[PDB]
Subunit: 461 residues, 3 copies
């Protein structure tokens, strides 16, 4: 008989699986909402700098109305290489935060010390890519190890996951401390790490530490040491499938599973995956209204406490967003609180600025009175941001990039406890100035020019 070659079949379930991590794909858990699960592991948070400035530049006339297609191409080219090195070293890319991403190495408690050596060596090879030579892009890496807690929340047709814990805080703080082209270990990490191998220098006014270089023992063989660590890695491609990047590529049609997975991904993306829409139309530089919500609590690391609150918060957010036409792009822990990245005009309608401000007030009013929510903080920005699918062929997500996305993210941090909006949203909308308040100009990190920032006061006095 003939033994014909079996072509890699590109099933919808395999296409959908590219938008999610192995954490979710092979994570079988109760459909009850919320849901929590606890485990240990190492977290890597890679952040690329200079792309929002590049995104701003690509809207200019010189790219001849191909700025969105020029941006995805160069953006994905560099991120694909990063994603490969994460996947090849046994990592799981959890989430794509615009030009930044969050990776995870999930392991049992005792095997952290060994994994951090793998994650550190991985992070150095990632940094090694962009020391060579896409002329002004830098990269920041923060590493943290310890207890992590997944939270899965949502309704019957949608689902959203996010990670919680001291490690999730540590990794972000570590990355904020990071200078241009540096690797920062949290205080719990480095303590967990094998201290004989890793050389470091102390950060000023900080208990975290910077990695200079690995100084491995004499007869050390990283190829052998890696193979030991792969024993504890669950879904690392092996045997016949060792040539693959992800085990998710080998998935087979399973209606039950696909129904579960499709809830996490947007309808626009599913239409494209189902071949009922062209691939290029999701990549675009369009005028949107960013609405960056941020919910803070008394104890941010307590999964059983904040889990129910975020579920209650989501159910209201998604409902009021649906009335005005908004959509939740991403949900993730952003500096001591869960943050919903909402977008209007993704759903293009006039009076979008008038809707966005009213919904921010609507969300603020409900979220303030939900139990255990200590502080609600919302930021609103409007302008030309990039929208599109960012990542590798086997691991990518739909995300938004731009200076207005940065702006809205800072506004909720720098102006907490209140709803805030930029100059474009203020003037574009036309409620009287009694509806707003002019705020003092604060100098903000990671943003060029705020202009006059305002606080949406409300309809009544």
């Amino acid at each position: 008989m003939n033994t014909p070659k079996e072509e890699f079949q590109d099933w919808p379930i395999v296409r959908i699986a590219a938008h999610l991590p192995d954490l979710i794909v092979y994570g079988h858990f109760s459909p009850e909402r919320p849901f929590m699960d606890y485990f240990d592991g190492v977290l890597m948070f890679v952040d690329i700098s200079g792309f929002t400035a590049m995104t701003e530049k690509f809207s200019s006339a010189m790219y001849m109305d191909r700025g969105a297609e020029q941006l995805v191409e160069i953006l994905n080219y560099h991120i694909s290489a990063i994603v490969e090195k994460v996947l090849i070293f046994g990592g799981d890319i959890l989430k794509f935060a615009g030009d930044a991403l969050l990776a995870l190495w999930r392991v049992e408690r005792k095997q952290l010390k060994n994994i951090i050596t793998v994650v550190i060596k991985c992070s150095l090879e990632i940094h090694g890519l962009f020391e060579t030579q896409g002329l002004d892009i830098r990269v920041k890496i923060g590493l943290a190890a310890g207890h992590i807690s997944m939270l899965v929340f949502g309704d019957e047709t949608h689902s959203h996951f996010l990670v919680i814990g001291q490690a999730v805080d540590d990794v972000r703080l570590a990355q904020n401390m990071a200078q241009m082209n540096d690797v920062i270990l949290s205080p719990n990490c480095w303590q967990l790490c094998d201290r004989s191998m890793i050389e470091i220098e102390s950060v000023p006014d900080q208990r975290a530490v910077k990695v200079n270089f690995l100084k491995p023992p004499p007869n050390f063989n990283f190829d052998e040491f890696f193979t030991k660590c792969t024993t504890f890695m669950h879904y690392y491609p092996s045997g016949e499938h060792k040539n693959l990047l992800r085990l998710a590529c080998t998935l087979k049609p399973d209606p039950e599973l696909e129904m579960s997975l499709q809830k996490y991904v947007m309808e626009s993306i599913l239409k494209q995956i189902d071949n009922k829409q062209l691939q290029g139309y999701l990549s675009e530089l369009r005028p949107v209204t960013i609405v960056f919500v941020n919910l803070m609590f008394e104890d941010q690391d307590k999964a059983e406490e904040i889990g129910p609150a975020i579920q209650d918060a989501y159910m209201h957010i998604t409902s009021v967003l649906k009335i005005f036409q908004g959509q939740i792009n991403k949900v993730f822990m952003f500096d001591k609180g869960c943050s919903f990245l909402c977008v209007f005009g993704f759903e293009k309608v006039p009076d979008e600025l008038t809707h966005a401000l009213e919904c921010a007030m609507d969300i603020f009013d409900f979220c303030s009175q939900v139990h255990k929510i200590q502080t609600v903080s919302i930021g609103v920005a409007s302008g030309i941001v990039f929208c599109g699918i960012v990542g590798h062929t086997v691991r990518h997500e739909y995300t938004v990039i731009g200076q207005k996305v940065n702006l809205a993210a800072r506004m909720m941090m720098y102006y907490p406890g209140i709803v805030t909006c930029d100059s474009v949203t203020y003037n574009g909308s036309n409620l009287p100035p009694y509806f707003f308040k002019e705020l003092p100009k604060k100098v903000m990190k990671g943003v060029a020019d705020s202009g006059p920032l305002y606080q949406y006061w409300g309809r009544t006095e």
Copy 2:
């Protein structure tokens, strides 16, 4: 010099060839209509059960308006494996009858006895796939060997082929006798088969027999025995091309040939093949009106007798269908008669129920008075049926699946000599009840609930 790798070129003629068997692709014959050709061979009729119930289930709310895409995926996943095993064992998939399919091993008279061993071993490996574990699907296989007669009919822009003979009757009867997960040999088969190898048990009130297992001679080598049989197989991939499933994959641009082949395939499919339409839009769960015609004769096996009649019948069918907006999905011998599967709203228009009943009457009136047509039987059903491309990448066809397709197929059998319509067609249309007659409720095989079935009586009394 450099010797670069030659990428498999996906020409339109190769794409079109996937919708047809090798019987038609490499069958060069006169363009006169009708056309008959006579030969010997073994027929396998594989039928999957439980998918119309699954199709009904996939229209529910839990699949979140991705039931059509969920269905094709799981359906094709299982059928692809079946198609592979047919193609790898040297078979030719003639036709896809919804979730069922018809295969053919064409050989000279004396080599039947050897081929049936190959077809039986093939059928056992096909049954072997679904004994393991898509939780409630069963499969039925019927096998028949003997004289077969092809009939090619149609007009100048369209063509339709179908097989005729005692073997074509035997194989269907064999499959109807088959219990869940069984292999049934016709009485002519088993007599043709090597009786020393095959063990069987007798079917009650039947001259056909069930296959239990192969009991091959002591020093038998199926790999060697297969290679002998491949000598008599014309188009079995070999040499440089042995890695391919079909020889049709190696086809090269030939306007003459492509003009001949494109007539067999629908315009909707050609538009998709020509890349003037997205792939996903043909896969859909849509409300249609099935019109299942069935023409019976005095001698069903006589190709020279019924061939001209079916040609005359087609020419009227296609003309009156074009007036109302119908389309012939499939034509094939279904239990002692040639049966046209027609579909309305494939061509979406209001008053589609009013058109379907009038055309059934129109077809009935003409077909009754065409010479040699003993009995005309038409069944009409309306509801949500699945439409889409079913099969393997190299061998697939556009077909329809659903409980309403089953219903219309039974109605013409159980209520012969008259036009019949279901409750949905009766009430949806609004001719007075004088135009219809209420029929007695018969218990029908392969259908859940008929409801009140009616007979379309006519305009006049």
Copy 3:
């Protein structure tokens, strides 16, 4: 660690690079317009005959409205084989002139003699393809070696390149002399070629010569001799990439470069490359209005003289074309002059014939008064011509084919110094006959039936 296979990534810059030669892709030069660059090399001009007759045939009823898709398929099938043999022998396909194409082997002065042996052996293998057996197609090859001069001209959003020199004239004249299935060397070639190897017969009333066959020295090894010549070839795939046809396939995202390259390609093609348009819709048999401009000079080979003139000519052409809706398909040296192939209704509008004639007059009036332009000659033809992407997957261009394209090309040659239009353009438009003049019927090469040809006289007397 795992070392996964790296799938050929199909970046937009790689897709765009297929529409251009290595001359342009790896040619880094000043953005000033015009730009000239001088070098030596061998030119091959392959021309296929009988396809415009085939194109005319494919518009008939027998192809069932798939003539455009049938034509591209068979056309590209034969041209792909030609393109491969050019690329494999180290050539660079400069331009696709409908069913004809222009190749280039760029080398230093002293290595011509060796390259011509490679080009001749290449041309014989190209001719060898179509001596076997797409029933009435012939091929003509002309070869010329010597000094070549590139000219790059255009505006800020578009660019156009073309080659100038005695070699560029020689190669066209050589091809015009060529009988059906012949290889013609120019007088400078053959003198450059190794005369011991190549056997020839003299052409009547001509200093050019026909190639009969190569008669290589005793212990000659073409595989070894080729490898010597590849030392002087810049971009010939080698090492890890020797399995590729073009080095351009290995291109990596470079915004600067991609901005430069995208100007050469049409917006319609970029939309398709960006996946915002289906591939099939550019392939079509549509009614157009061809406007074939031809600018002649005192010294056609002088790059510094005619370069500025063509730049000045282009800037007016593109502007007046944009008013009426025209588009420049191709620009190239056609028999002693630079020729712009313009097309209307590519931009479908009524009164397209009324626009085309006025623009021809507009272009004629300006171009006549531009310095150094000795003779302006314009031809206008209207009818069903083929439009689509012609070539290989790695090297293809958007071009137009048809008898009306031939007609407009002859009209400007046979009726120089004036604007001319065919019978279809005359009668379809409705300016009074005072606006036109009836011309005498000249017998023209490469066209079937002119009908009454007219001269667009003008609005005033």
